[PDB]
Amino acid sequence: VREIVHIQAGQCGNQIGAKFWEVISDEHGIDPTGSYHGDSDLQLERINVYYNEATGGKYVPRAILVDLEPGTMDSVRAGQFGQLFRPDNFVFGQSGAGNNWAKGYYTEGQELCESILDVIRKEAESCDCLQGFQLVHSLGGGTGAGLGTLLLNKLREEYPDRILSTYSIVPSPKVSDTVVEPYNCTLSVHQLVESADEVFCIDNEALYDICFRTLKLTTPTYGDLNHLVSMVMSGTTCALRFPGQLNSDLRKLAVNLVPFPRLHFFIVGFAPLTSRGSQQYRALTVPELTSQLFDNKNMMAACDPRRGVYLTASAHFRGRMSSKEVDEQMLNIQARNTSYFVEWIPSNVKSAICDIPPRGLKMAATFIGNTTAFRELFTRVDSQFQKMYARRAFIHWYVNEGLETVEFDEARSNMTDLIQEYEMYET
Amino acid sequence: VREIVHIQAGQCGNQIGAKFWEVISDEHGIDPTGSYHGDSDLQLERINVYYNEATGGKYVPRAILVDLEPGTMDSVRAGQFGQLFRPDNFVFGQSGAGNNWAKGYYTEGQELCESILDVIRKEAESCDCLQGFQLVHSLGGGTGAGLGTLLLNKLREEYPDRILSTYSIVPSPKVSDTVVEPYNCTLSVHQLVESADEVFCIDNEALYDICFRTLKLTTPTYGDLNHLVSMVMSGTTCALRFPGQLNSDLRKLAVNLVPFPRLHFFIVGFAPLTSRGSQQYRALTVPELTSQLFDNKNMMAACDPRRGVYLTASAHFRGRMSSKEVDEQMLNIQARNTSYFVEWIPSNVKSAICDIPPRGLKMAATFIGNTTAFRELFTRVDSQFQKMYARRAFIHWYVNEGLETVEFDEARSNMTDLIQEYEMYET
Amino acid sequence: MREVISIHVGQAGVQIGNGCWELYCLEHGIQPDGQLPDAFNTFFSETGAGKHVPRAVFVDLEPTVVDEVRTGTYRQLFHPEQLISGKEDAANNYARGHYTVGKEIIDLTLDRIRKLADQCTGLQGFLIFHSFGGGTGAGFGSLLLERLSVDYGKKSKLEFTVYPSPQVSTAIVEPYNSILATHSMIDHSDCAFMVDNEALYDLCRRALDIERPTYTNLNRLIGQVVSSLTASLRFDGALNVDFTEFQTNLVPYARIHFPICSYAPVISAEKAYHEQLSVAEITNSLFEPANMMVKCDPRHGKYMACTLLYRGDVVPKDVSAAVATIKTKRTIQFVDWCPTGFKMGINYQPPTVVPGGDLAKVQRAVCMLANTTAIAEAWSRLDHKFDLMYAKRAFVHWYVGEGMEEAEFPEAREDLALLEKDYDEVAAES
Amino acid sequence: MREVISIHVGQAGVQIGNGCWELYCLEHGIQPDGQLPDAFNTFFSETGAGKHVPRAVFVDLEPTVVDEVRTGTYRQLFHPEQLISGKEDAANNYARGHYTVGKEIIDLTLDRIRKLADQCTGLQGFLIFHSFGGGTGAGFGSLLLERLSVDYGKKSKLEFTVYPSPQVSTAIVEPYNSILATHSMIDHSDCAFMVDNEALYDLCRRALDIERPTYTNLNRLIGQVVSSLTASLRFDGALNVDFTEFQTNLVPYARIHFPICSYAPVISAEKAYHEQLSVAEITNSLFEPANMMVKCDPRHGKYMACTLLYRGDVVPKDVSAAVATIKTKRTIQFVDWCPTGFKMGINYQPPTVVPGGDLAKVQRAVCMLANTTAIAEAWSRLDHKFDLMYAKRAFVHWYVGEGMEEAEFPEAREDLALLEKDYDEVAAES
Ligand SMILES: Nc1nc2c(ncn2[C@@H]2O[C@H](COP(=O)(O)OP(=O)(O)OP(=O)(O)O)[C@@H](O)[C@H]2O)c(=O)[nH]1
Ligand SMILES: Nc1nc2c(ncn2[C@@H]2O[C@H](COP(=O)(O)OP(=O)(O)OP(=O)(O)O)[C@@H](O)[C@H]2O)c(=O)[nH]1
Ligand SMILES: Nc1nc2c(ncn2[C@@H]2O[C@H](COP(=O)(O)OP(=O)(O)O)[C@@H](O)[C@H]2O)c(=O)[nH]1
Ligand SMILES: Nc1nc2c(ncn2[C@@H]2O[C@H](COP(=O)(O)OP(=O)(O)O)[C@@H](O)[C@H]2O)c(=O)[nH]1
Ligand SMILES: [Mg+2]
Ligand SMILES: [Mg+2]
After folding, report:
1. Does the beta carbon of D215 lie inside 6 Å of ligand 2?
2. Which residue of B77, B106, B177, B226 to mutate against D (max D Cβ within 10 Å)?
3. B96 with D323: Cβ contact below 8 A
4. Is the dihedral of CA A310, A312, A317, A322 positive or negative?
5. Ligand 3 and A98: CB distance under 6 A
6. Is the omega angle on the peptide bond into residue A220 within 30 degrees of 0, that is, cis?
7. How far is the CA of D333 from the centre of ligand 4 (A)?
8. Which helix (H) or strand (E) holds B6?
9. Signal peptide: which range, if any (chains C, D) (predicted)?
10. Which residues, 6 or more positions from A392, have their beta carbon under 8 angstroms from its beta carbon?
């Protein structure tokens, strides 16, 4: 009984969440009509974490959909698992998406915020317990980046104790999808740093790179890209949902990985991944999982760890396995590559074990780490923001929504200090 | 548990590699699909030396294939034993071979080197132990001669302890297959002498000559030529793979046969050899094997030992046979031809016995020796090098890559001293 | 559900509108009578039973072009009120189309457009078409836009206008109407797209294999671009792009807003046998100066912002690879202060062919919209053309006689010079 | 996989191009329509369904030769873009094909050549054909190479051109165009093979039993040489030879890159019925001056690095025996500083016969490329023929009027002298 409320914002957030509920429903064995037809009694132990009960033994997810325009959820209504969602949880505006952080936050955000919050209050106060909130949003966009941060602050104000873990897609470092991304990202950075306990950064370029390198997918679509992400959040919450030899929930993760309140941005990765042709030849075991996890190519964010140094790391394991083998590997990889770890923190790596692996895979692992390599990610947007901010004129679009000049200067100054904060702790 | 990592480079190495794995897989009894269907339990004792296991009841060789073009690789895929190799171990470029040592070393070598090294690191750090690395490459080409030496230097840097035994094909003096052979060989010799522990030299002239004299092959192809090489590495590592009355592995061989760090180039030969129709008339005993082993016509290197003197020699015997008979022949052959051995090192013939013979032979023997006859091989290339070097113009194809002209002088200077070093020890 | 309104002013707008709805009826699958043998409500309105109606208004000060649709086959599709025709045209005179005759009918049309907006609950943008050289296109277009700015305020007013060609010219007074309308467009329009006939002619002969095209063929090429632009709002896609998204990214300044357009692939039947038409190939074609429908070389200027719109078989993986390849071509210039410069949009609905058409049935296609200072080459030619007329006062008498004060001639000249300063000041680097 | 791009210039280029592409399609398996009733990727591109398109460009400044292809049987195979035809030929004038008329079409041709390069992921070189005496071949060919040198740089540009015959000449101004082209060939080309019609005429009569051949027969023999050269790049063999390997072996000096070509066996369909044609026989036939396809005797000079290519039944053991026998020939000369002098390669695909062909169905065959100092004999003849015409200034007026500055005449004369010195300087011994 550690219920988690799920909120989806924007074009990116809604479509990732739709793929998310396919994975969780299949794992628990929930039929698309909303009724259990699965195969194990263990699935019914703690289904309360994500699902709320309906009459007639029907189970409804604790999901809330947020957008500024109806087009997105109309596709969701036509989805395979569209029937699963609760009809009233669809909250939306009737104005243009904007792709503008100022417009999404102020003009349409205030009207949307009040209606959304009471919808959240329906699920938040309907169950016996509530551990944390889960948010999916885009930062390069206007709706998810703008309205998501506004709703993020309100969630903290009403529920300070609960864990505000969010999943975000980062504006791509090399080729991206919006000209004014540095404006939208930098403004959201100030809101994200102070309010959110845990932030995971995701890049599409790595998603393209992982699919081409390992999976050999000639035409990897957003369905495949959203599928790979959906393993990450499924694995993290698996500790709550199933028993294991060493339990590790969100609050355990935050205490171990976060040494200081602002250094909490995380890189994530999943193992095992193998091409269909080459999956026969592999010797899948615990050490083989360790090789993939710490491999720089598998990490789902385009910030090469070898260029930085590690502060904390954590690995999750699923399956009936040896405890010694997991504990031995975590020590070996620590001593082998000491050049990338901080001296003044020993035992930089955390480990955990879960009993039930996902379908089709006898064993699976998830890796989450924190390192100074994020300075690369922020340097990219910082240099591009300065190049924009010399050219004032784009502010004129944001000025129409009441955004003042000091907001851009405040956003950069805090984000620049975030780069500096990671710089000093490297010593 | 003395695993050996196998690396193949160039057009010559890959075609040799394909025939080599036919011999080893046949001896152990592995189905071309990668499954065991053999006939003896002794085969499964120490198959770990060359093979890795896949969870689907599959056995995979510890092989890494390197080339600059896919044309040689695609031939191997269509080979009979193509499916055996692990799909990810194929590392290839997208540029012509060039047949240029400078181009292979500098331009295309650096790009491939980093990718190849980590693939090697996969197999190198995957097994409980690793005795040495086995390399197959040609010294008259541009790909194997250039990139093979570059990878040889990097292997020494990361794994100084391990035995870097290599098998090389030296350009044939009578009929050269490449106009620029002297340039490529001389530059590679400088890298090979200082870095490699053991080097075996093979000449196609003797392979043609032995096939015509002994086997009576009217039309011997490269399949037969590469097959005659096949048992040489098969016999050498056979001491690791199978029990015997006296074991002798690579490190035993290197210590005995190498008196000084720079005098380690070896001549090799195999017995018995008989035409496929004259085998009926030949009684097969140990003394008959020794007669072929020391006969000058059975050496696969075209440097007559009689023109030089012997320093060290080793013989390997496979099959259930008398130990006295082997020991007496070494004494007899040493005393009978004292004119060809150095006085100041007694007992120049080393011996070893292995229990299990190879397939198709009831008793077999392998010879490895070191002698001053290598001065003939280096005289041929050096005399041709001086002829070519005065006509500086072929350096044009090497200068454009970035090679300095003084490197040619350095390569000749070191190889000249190696000729001198063998000259002095003849006294 | 979500609505967009189209307004057509002048003969060029009416004929293009005929081609545009000709394409949309085929695209959605709606018979010319309004029956069926989805995205309908974005462009159409239902009347019960089985009859649909376009959200369009046709305006011209003379009935010849309008009566063609009235007598044409498509007559039953359109609502009779939507077709508004004047009595006598503006005679290619800006003053006649703005002050004397324009004000006779301006408020009659404004009631009609506002009436259509009542049925458009999700109205979030207008589409307005012009011909700069025409009197009604410039004179009446300015008067309509000035009213629509105050009638609706912060609603996106998108324009698709035919700019005068560098050398191909059919009206002597063509430079006069263009500069006068220039002042009206720059302040009131949210964003106006530039195209010219001379570049349209050349592409219609080289890429599409036509010996001798007509205005009908040129209009169908125009309709394809608008269909691709509106496909994001109408049909499903991995990367939806809204009108406001185009407004925010494409224009770095308020007055620099003017973009340029391109489309690929533009290929005939037999030429499509031999080309595989990959994502990389079609993206590569969008950047050659030969494919611009504005006859200005991009190499004369630089690129500030670009938007890519893909339809059909396209997969997001190849888009990132294709765009990254484009970035390497530094025969193409971007200003350092705009490093990103791209938004891509992916849609699943393939292009729709038309009977008697000129395009091959390609499985995938892409549309291009970008802003550049290469347009400043076009403005300089118009400025030099105008000065020759006005130095000797070549046609002042006609315009003053129709109510216009002469003082508007230098003021429109000054506004053009100020806009030309803006582009060159923007072109400066730090 | 790994691709080679072919450019054809002039009447000689197009007609040789016919002979080559019949043999390639009539080797691989492709019908003239592009369908099938492997190595395809090296020479052909795939468009889906079952249709293939060559990686070739055909260029001439006059339409007669190209329109034969457009109206011919093989018209459907080629992409209409690939066939480029000018308006009026250069009239055997170097300046006209270089400065005045050549620059009218040069930038159109390079776009299509570069466009084809995009599809070739594994491009490893180009093949270019010329006629030295022609105006377009020498004039436009020099302009094409100079651009391709800077466009792509470190990619092998291999050429296969027709050198002027020692006595047979169809153009009076032949010496003028050849020498001006020679300066451009030497500095930009990686390697260029020489063949001349006079030797092929004698070979096609003696070896092949033909009373009175035409250009079609000579082009068929040319097609065999190019196919054997690429045979190592298309099908399996015990000794592969890549394009980059030929570049290093056959080029001893930066400016001594011209090889000479020979092929064996060359026997009629009747007389092969009596002869076994072992490896020794075919290897022995190559070195005779009668077989060689350039009318210069190697015995006059010395030999350089050579290449041997074997197709079909050949076994590597017999190659070493045959080549060793070659070294025993005291009628063959080598320089002491080139002791090895040989590179051999073997492919298993046998030669392909031609519809209505002139050759026999030989099971095994050999192709040969050699660098020799005997080519200085050819250079001296061309040099002497040039001085007589320039001394009295026989034809300077035509070239001057078409943009050429007369100072080019002594420069091309001086550059040829240095090459003649280079061949003598290298031929010296120490
Ligand atoms: N591309 C294209 N341009 C057109 C078409 N019809 C008219 N034009 C343009 O319109 C210009 C002439 O002005 P008009 O067509 O008369 O437009 P107008 O505003 O109604 O002018 P008036 O008739 O005087 O009221 C020409 O120069 C064309 O460029 C068309 O069907 N296609
Ligand atoms: N072997 C061979 N040579 C040819 C063939 N056609 C033309 N030639 C050679 O080309 C020379 C004449 O020049 P052209 O064929 O016209 O080449 P060009 O560069 O196009 O010259 P222009 O027609 O003036 O543009 C002749 O002397 C021939 O030697 C051919 O089909 N086979
Ligand atoms: N992987 C993935 N990325 C998406 C998806 N939808 C949108 N994005 C990315 O999200 C970024 C911004 O999208 P946007 O439409 O502006 O989101 P919003 O404005 O917050 O609703 C773009 O760079 C897209 O590449 C999706 O379904 N999958
Ligand atoms: N015995 C044998 N020799 C070979 C084989 N393939 C190539 N060679 C020899 O290797 C030498 C050089 O080969 P090359 O292609 O240049 O190797 P690379 O350039 O390093 O890949 C030539 O003289 C060949 O005779 C083979 O399959 N067997
Ligand atoms: Mg009109
Ligand atoms: Mg010609």
Report:
1. yes
2. B177
3. no
4. positive
5. no
6. no
7. 27
8. strand B4-9
9. none
10. none
Pairing outcome for strands A364-371 and A265-271: antiparallel
**CB C284 within 8 Å of CB A185:** no
- Contact flag B391-D316 (C-beta cutoff 8 Å): no
Q: Tell me the three-class secondary structure of A38-78, residue by residue.
A: CCCHHHHCCHHHCEEEECCCEEEECEEEEECCCHHHHHHHC
Task: Please give the residue of chain B at the shortest CA–CA distance from D232.
Answer: B71
- CB-CB contact of A136 with A169 (8 Å): no
DSSP-assigned beta bridge partners for residue B371: B310
CA–centroid distance for D365 within its chain = 19
Q: How far is CA A94 from CA A71, A111, B195, in A?
A: 10, 11, 73
| Technique behind the model | cryo-EM
Closest to C316 (Cβ–Cβ): which among A103, A178, A221? A221
Q: How far apart are the CA of D127 and the nearest CA of chain B, in angstroms?
A: 16
CA distance A294 to A335: 13
Query: How many residues does the structure list for chain D?
Result: 430
- 3-class secondary structure, B292: helix
State whether A278 and B54 contact (CB < 8 Å): no
Annotated active-site residue C245? The verdict is yes
Tell me the H-state helices in D153-276: 174-188, 197-206, 215-234, 243-250
CB–CB of C145/C180 below 8 Å?
no
Nearest Cα to Cα of residue A387 among B139, D367, C261, C430: C430
Q: Which of D107, D118, D120, D151 is the best mutation test for C, with the most CBs of C within 10 A? A: D118
Most ligand 1 atoms within 8 A of CB, residue of C11, C89, C197 to mutate: C11
Do residues A408 and A382 make contact, with C-beta atoms less than 8 angstroms apart? no
Q: What is the resolution of this structure in A?
A: 4.2
Half-sphere exposure (Cβ direction) of A420: Cα atoms closer than 13 Å: 6
Mention every residue, 6+ apart, whose C-beta is less than 8 A from residue B402: B102, B106, B107
Sign (positive or negative) of CA dihedral B51, B52, B58, B61? negative
- Strand segments, DSSP code E, in B234-390 are 265-271, 310-318, 349-354, 364-371
Task: Determine the Cα–Cα distance for residues C344 and C311; give it in Å rounded to an integer.
Answer: 11
Breaks (C-N over 2.5 A) in chain A follow: none
Residue from D115, A424, B70 nearest C274 by CA: D115
* Burial label, D153 (beta-carbon count in 10 A; 0-12, 13-18, 19+): exposed
> Ligand 2, atom 26: nearest CA belongs to which residue?
D170
Coil vs helix vs strand at C97: helix
Min Cα–Cα distance to chain B from D57, Å: 24
Report the phi/psi class of residue A16: left, alpha or beta, with left for phi > 0 and alpha for psi in -120 to 50: alpha
Q: Which of A393, A427, A419, A423 is nearest to A408 (CA)?
A: A393
Give residue D137 CA to ligand 2 midpoint distance, Å: 8
> Which of B53, B85, B88, B121 would you mutate first to test chain A, the one with the most A CBs within 10 A?
B88
Q: Kindly calculate the radius of gyration of chain A based on its CA atoms and give it in whole angstroms.
A: 21
Could you identify the residue written with the tokens 């995957």? B126
Ligand with minimal distance to B99 CA: 4
The CA distance from D25 to the nearest CA of chain B, in Å, is 21
Alpha-carbon distance A278 to nearest alpha carbon in chain B (angstroms): 6
Output DSSP code: residue A317.
Answer: E
Give C245's contacts in chain A (Cβ within 8 Å): 96-99, 142
- Tell me how far apart the alpha carbons of residues D352 and D312 are, in angstroms, rounded to a whole number: 11
Tell me the β-bridge partners of B271.
Answer: B365
Chain B CB contacts of D240 below 8 Å = 11, 71-72
Q: What is the CA radius of gyration of chain D?
A: 21
